Amino acid sequence: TCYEGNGHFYRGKASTDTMGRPCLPWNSATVLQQTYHAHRSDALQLGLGKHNYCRNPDNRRRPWCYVQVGLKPLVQECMVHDCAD
């Protein structure tokens, strides 16, 4: 057990996810467009903060993020304390 739950404000300052793909701004003209951004007051209260990092916009077993790859934001969880046993 490493990530006890998903972790809201539990240090999610990584613009780099598991597949080594760079995580970005939540409030980005791209994610803000998507389904999980700074826009919905709760997202932030659930784990976001208009950062540019893997956090909890849902309740993933470990902080995740979308990663714009050639105009293609794709979610890949972050290589944090997720306990990939």
Contacts of 29 (CB under 8 A, 6+ apart): none
Q: Output the six-digit token pair for 59.
A: 């309740």
The domain in which residue 84 lies consists of 1-85
CATH of the domain at 68: 2.40.20.10
Question: Please, which contacts does 39-48 make with residues 24 or more away whose CB atoms are closer than 8 Å?
Answer: 45/8, 46/8, 47/6, 47/7, 47/8, 47/9, 47/12
Number of domains in the chain: 1
Q: Tell me which H or E stretch contains 41.
A: helix 41-46
Read off the amino acid at residue 31. Answer: V
Method: NMR
The pairing of beta strand 64-68 with beta strand 73-77: antiparallel
3-class DSSP state for residue 68? Answer: strand
